[PDB]
Amino acid sequence: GSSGSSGLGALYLSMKDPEKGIKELNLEKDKKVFNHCLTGSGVIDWLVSNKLVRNRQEGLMISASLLSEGYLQPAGDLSKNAADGIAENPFLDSPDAFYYFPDSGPSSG
Predict the structure, then answer these.
(1) How far apart are CA 44 and CA 107, in angstroms?
(2) Closest CA to 108 of 50, 38, 59, 35
(3) Residue ranges per domain, the chain?
(4) Class of the 1-109 domain?
């Protein structure tokens, strides 16, 4: 959805930019590496970093909108369990939660 979702789209399109957008590091958990992944909080960090909102909170909400649409895929836990049907907020402003775009993500190999 690049022609729809007025706002998110554009925003997302940016997130793709590894320079003018969100970064991409390799995080771990237990015993699993995750390449081309982000962070629940980080995702918002880029938002605040660029000043997409007034505070982290705002981002927390927006973030959801991003994830919801499917611009951010859950990887690991929490985020998933959330997307499942936790509350009215699928996103989790936590450094533990991790997300990735449906195109890159942790490439097998």
Answers:
(1) 24
(2) 35
(3) 1-109
(4) mainly alpha
